[PDB]
């Protein structure tokens, strides 16, 4: 039910693109050069994961987009985007992935 999106300007424009809609996700889906949005907003769980090599524009776009998802998908009004750096992932985030190590 969760979806994972890439937020990157590496392809020439700033783009939010779906990378996973089958659960659980591959840990290797998270690429250090970009940011990712993990959307499980129906229960208020939305994450921005910031790759260590992503750029400032990607971080800002990922946070803006994750915030806009709350509004546009009618997620609960008190939902807070959880922002995590590569290497600082929490159990709540890792639970979405297969065999995180
Ligand atoms: Ca990038």
Swiss-Prot record:
Tissues showing expression? Phagocytic cells, platelets, fibroblasts, nonmuscle cells, smooth and skeletal muscle cells.
Which spans of this chain does UniProt mark as Gelsolin-like repeats? Answer: 21-93
**Binding-site positions, Ca(2+) 4:** 33-34, 58
Q: How does it assemble?
A: Binds to actin and to fibronectin. Identified in a complex composed of ACTA1, COBL, GSN and TMSB4X. Interacts with the inactive form of EIF2AK2/PKR. Interacts with FLII.
Q: Write out the function statement from the record.
A: Calcium-regulated, actin-modulating protein that binds to the plus (or barbed) ends of actin monomers or filaments, preventing monomer exchange (end-blocking or capping). It can promote the assembly of monomers into filaments (nucleation) as well as sever filaments already formed. Plays a role in ciliogenesis.
- Domain description: Comprises six structurally related gelsolin-like (G1-G6) domains, that, in a calcium-free environment, are packed together to form a compact globular structure in which the putative actin-binding sequences are not sufficiently exposed to enable binding to occur. Binding calcium may release the connections that join the N- and C-terminal halves of gelsolin, enabling each half to bind actin relatively independently. G1 and G4 bind two Ca(2+) in a type I and in a type II manner. G2, G3, G5 and G6 bind only one Ca(2+) in a type II manner.
Q: Which disease is it linked to?
A: Amyloidosis, hereditary systemic 4, Finnish type: A form of hereditary systemic amyloidosis, a disorder characterized by amyloid deposition in multiple tissues resulting in a wide clinical spectrum. AMYLD4 is due to gelsolin amyloid deposition and is typically characterized by cranial neuropathy and lattice corneal dystrophy. Most patients have modest involvement of internal organs, but severe systemic disease can develop in some individuals causing peripheral polyneuropathy, amyloid cardiomyopathy, and nephrotic syndrome leading to renal failure.
Family affiliation? Belongs to the villin/gelsolin family.
Name listed for the protein in its UniProt record: Gelsolin
- Organism, by scientific name, is Homo sapiens
Its gene name is GSN
Q: Which residues of the full protein are shown?
A: 297 to 397 of 782
């Amino acid at each position: 039910l969760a979806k994972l999106y890439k937020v990157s300007n590496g392809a020439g424009t700033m783009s939010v693109s779906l990378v996973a809609d089958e659960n659980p996700f591959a840990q290797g889906a998270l690429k250090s050069e970009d940011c990712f949005i993990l959307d499980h907003g129906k229960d208020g769980k939305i994450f921005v994961w910031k790759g260590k090599q992503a750029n400032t524009e990607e971080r800002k776009a990922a946070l803006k987009t994750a915030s806009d998802f709350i509004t546009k998908m009618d997620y609960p009004k008190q939902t807070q985007v959880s922002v995590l750096p590569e290497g600082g992932e929490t159990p709540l985030f890792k639970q979405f992935f297969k065999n995180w190590r």
